[PDB]
Design an enzyme around this catalytic site. Structure first.
Site, PDB file in Angstrom:
ATOM      1  N   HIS A 154     -35.044  49.187  25.706  1.00 19.55           N
ATOM      2  CA  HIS A 154     -35.052  47.723  25.723  1.00 19.55           C
ATOM      3  C   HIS A 154     -35.924  47.144  26.848  1.00 19.55           C
ATOM      4  O   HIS A 154     -36.064  45.927  26.909  1.00 19.55           O
ATOM      5  CB  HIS A 154     -33.649  47.092  25.696  1.00 19.55           C
ATOM      6  CG  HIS A 154     -32.860  47.204  26.965  1.00 19.55           C
ATOM      7  ND1 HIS A 154     -31.778  48.059  27.063  1.00 19.55           N
ATOM      8  CD2 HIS A 154     -32.990  46.526  28.129  1.00 19.55           C
ATOM      9  CE1 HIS A 154     -31.309  47.901  28.290  1.00 19.55           C
ATOM     10  NE2 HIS A 154     -32.019  46.993  28.972  1.00 19.55           N
ATOM     11  N   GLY A 173     -30.587  43.840  35.765  1.00 18.32           N
ATOM     12  CA  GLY A 173     -31.538  44.660  36.512  1.00 18.32           C
ATOM     13  C   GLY A 173     -31.049  46.078  36.771  1.00 18.32           C
ATOM     14  O   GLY A 173     -31.853  46.945  37.149  1.00 18.32           O
ATOM     15  N   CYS A 232     -29.910  48.177  34.511  1.00 19.86           N
ATOM     16  CA  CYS A 232     -30.227  49.042  33.385  1.00 19.86           C
ATOM     17  C   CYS A 232     -31.148  50.176  33.803  1.00 19.86           C
ATOM     18  O   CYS A 232     -32.028  49.966  34.622  1.00 19.86           O
ATOM     19  CB  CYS A 232     -30.804  48.226  32.237  1.00 19.86           C
ATOM     20  SG  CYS A 232     -29.700  46.919  31.645  1.00 19.86           S
TER      21      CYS A 232
HETATM   22  O1  OQL Z   1     -26.661  43.988  28.859  1.00 13.42           O
HETATM   23  C1  OQL Z   1     -27.731  43.837  29.447  1.00 13.42           C
HETATM   24  N1  OQL Z   1     -27.871  43.981  30.780  1.00 13.42           N
HETATM   25  C2  OQL Z   1     -26.852  44.181  31.725  1.00 13.42           C
HETATM   26  C3  OQL Z   1     -26.259  45.415  31.982  1.00 13.42           C
HETATM   27  N2  OQL Z   1     -25.223  45.604  32.808  1.00 13.42           N
HETATM   28  C4  OQL Z   1     -24.729  44.539  33.430  1.00 13.42           C
HETATM   29  C5  OQL Z   1     -25.229  43.223  33.276  1.00 13.42           C
HETATM   30  C6  OQL Z   1     -24.698  42.103  33.962  1.00 13.42           C
HETATM   31  C7  OQL Z   1     -25.243  40.865  33.791  1.00 13.42           C
HETATM   32  C8  OQL Z   1     -26.315  40.675  32.933  1.00 13.42           C
HETATM   33  C9  OQL Z   1     -26.851  41.727  32.246  1.00 13.42           C
HETATM   34  C10 OQL Z   1     -26.330  43.037  32.398  1.00 13.42           C
HETATM   35  C11 OQL Z   1     -29.018  43.463  28.714  1.00 13.42           C
HETATM   36  C12 OQL Z   1     -29.330  41.963  28.834  1.00 13.42           C
HETATM   37  C13 OQL Z   1     -28.333  41.145  28.035  1.00 13.42           C
HETATM   38  N3  OQL Z   1     -28.256  41.623  26.660  1.00 13.42           N
HETATM   39  C14 OQL Z   1     -28.473  42.934  26.305  1.00 13.42           C
HETATM   40  C15 OQL Z   1     -28.241  43.343  24.989  1.00 13.42           C
HETATM   41  C16 OQL Z   1     -28.398  44.672  24.635  1.00 13.42           C
HETATM   42  C17 OQL Z   1     -28.807  45.579  25.590  1.00 13.42           C
HETATM   43 CL1  OQL Z   1     -29.037  47.243  25.147  1.00 13.42          CL
HETATM   44  C18 OQL Z   1     -29.044  45.200  26.891  1.00 13.42           C
HETATM   45  C19 OQL Z   1     -28.866  43.877  27.267  1.00 13.42           C
END
Ligand code: OQL
Ligand code: OQL
Lengths: 304, 304
Positions: free
Chosen positions: B41, B143, B145
């Protein structure tokens, strides 16, 4: 989101751990520049610990009696000195992995990471706090002496603790990197009992703010209180008195959530009086006090 | 003595963290040999996440669109490929700090350490478990990820998790280092709800053994039970069923304490039915399930 008891990355401190052997005693040492720091009780046998006279015991020790091994290579000891309860062993080689560092003496309520070591090798890393009774609730076995406590500010490692002993109650006592014990403890195998383990109020409030930030809001009530009223309740529950300095330090968390510090105090007051009623806050069934306001802001902002 | 949620020393993994930027998205990557691993992603904008077609999106990306920075020096990307939900970026330089490593896919109930990173820089380290519903209860911000989960066996780092996303409930989902998600989660900004978060029974029993070893013995009772009787109670409390494999794995802890596994099950059964009555076990007011039997033996023996 999510809130965990997080420790600092330990790499910078792993590169400093060495093994120090004196006679039949082996413990850990901290190698910074050309000096190895270790508990002075490395010169003692278990029989010496009953009533050791460290100055007299040290007279029978020469540079060649202190065996320092870094990884699997021996370091040459060219000098030794006792500073309070630590030995400083001058080696002929500066540690090439010495990070930027400071020796700091922390106050009770302050948190730090410990890299538990055995035979100069790291076994694990965990976070803990200097208790108001100057003990730490660590995880240490025989051979862990010389393991250190530290904080990191970007690239600078502030060493604050060196592990020396376990009290009969299973709590731990140690020194700052100048060899001065935290609290009244002495490096002797004698009756030393810890004082009252009071709860660090400012830290509990910081953790309540962390819970609000992470979505756990059930404990928020319609009340407020005063520092004096709150402290009447806090004394009854063996919680440290809350001061205006603590309120000031909680300011950024209060600003982030929009919950005034004294309103959070009223919430805490009700939690003390009514209990949790089988509920949890950030996955805990008790009020956590080993996160400072600085730790909460750090974890919720992502300082690297 | 003392029992802490201990993480592995993170140094070996800190030396692998890099920053990966693709367009306006910056996340972390893992640099092992001449390959940088990162969540696929990284090629998406937040609008793409709604319904991304990764194969189509990747067609518009070339080697020069993936910016890899290790510390403060740029790595040259000479190849890129998608394996499941991870991107493998071939760089022209092998990581000189690559430790001995393996890519392992863990089972629910297994624990690991996470080194949380932002912009390729480590912020902290903590221990967690793969939940029976295939989520992890981490501490991750935007950030984070690309941060990884791992175990260490002496000098070998077994990487088991790469962080990809946070579900609306504040729990986390990610993949093994082959890009396969743990559980049914997909790397899409869509309605994904976690299943039942059951308690890891074998881990709770291991932690009860850790408490006995560390002096907390109040919960030991005069009873015993059978696997079938215990499991009737365990199902009622959303605890995983206990098997003979679990009893076998608890064998060394049973031998160390002299408390038969089924006797510890009866103690656990009474704790489930009666609660803690305001008491604590190893400083906790709830039954901890994120320590495996291996973790308990490790912490109580000092494996480095
Ligand atoms: O979850 C994700 N990132 C994060 C990961 N961990 C804690 C977070 C805390 C706060 C904001 C983001 C966070 C990303 C962006 C949001 N949507 C999304 C959808 C699918 C996938 Cl694979 C990744 C994402
Ligand atoms: O406490 C000490 N070491 C330990 C330290 N931490 C956890 C331990 C667990 C299990 C066995 C030992 C442990 C040593 C040896 C015992 N007596 C003693 C007396 C004074 C001083 Cl300064 C050091 C010591």
């Amino acid at each position: 989101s999510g809130f965990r008891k997080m420790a600092f990355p330990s790499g910078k401190v792993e590169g400093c751990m060495v093994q120090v052997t004196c006679g039949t005693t082996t413990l850990n040492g901290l190698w910074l520049d050309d000096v190895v720091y270790c508990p002075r009780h490395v010169i003692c046998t278990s029989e010496d610990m009953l009533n050791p006279n460290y100055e007299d015991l040290l007279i029978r020790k020469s540079n060649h009696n202190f065996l320092v091994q870094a990884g699997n290579v021996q370091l040459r000891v060219i000098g030794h000195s006792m500073q309070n309860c630590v030995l400083k062993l001058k080696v002929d080689t500066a540690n090439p992995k010495t990070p930027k560092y400071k020796f700091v003496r922390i106050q009770p309520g302050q948190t730090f990471s410990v890299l538990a070591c055995y035979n100069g090798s790291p076994s694990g890393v965990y976070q803990c706090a200097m208790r108001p009774n100057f003990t730490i609730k660590g995880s240490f076995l025989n051979g862990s002496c010389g393991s250190v406590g530290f904080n990191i500010d970007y690239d600078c490692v502030s060493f604050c603790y060196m592990h020396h002993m376990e009290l009969p109650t299973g709590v731990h006592a140690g020194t700052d990197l100048e060899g001065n014990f935290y609290g009244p403890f002495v490096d002797r195998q004698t009756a030393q009992a810890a004082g009252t383990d009071t709860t660090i109020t400012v830290n509990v409030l910081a953790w309540l703010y962390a819970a609000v930030i992470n979505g756990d809001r059930w404990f928020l009530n319609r009340f407020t209180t005063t520092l004096n009223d709150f402290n009447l309740v806090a004394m009854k529950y063996n919680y440290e008195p809350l001061t205006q300095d603590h309120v000031d330090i909680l300011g950024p968390l209060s600003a982030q959530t929009g919950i005034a510090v004294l309103d959070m105090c009223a919430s805490l007051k009700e939690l003390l009086q009514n209990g949790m009623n089988g509920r949890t806050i950030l996955g805990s069934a008790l009020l956590e006090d080993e996160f400072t306001p600085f730790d909460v802001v750090r974890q919720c902002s992502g300082v690297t």
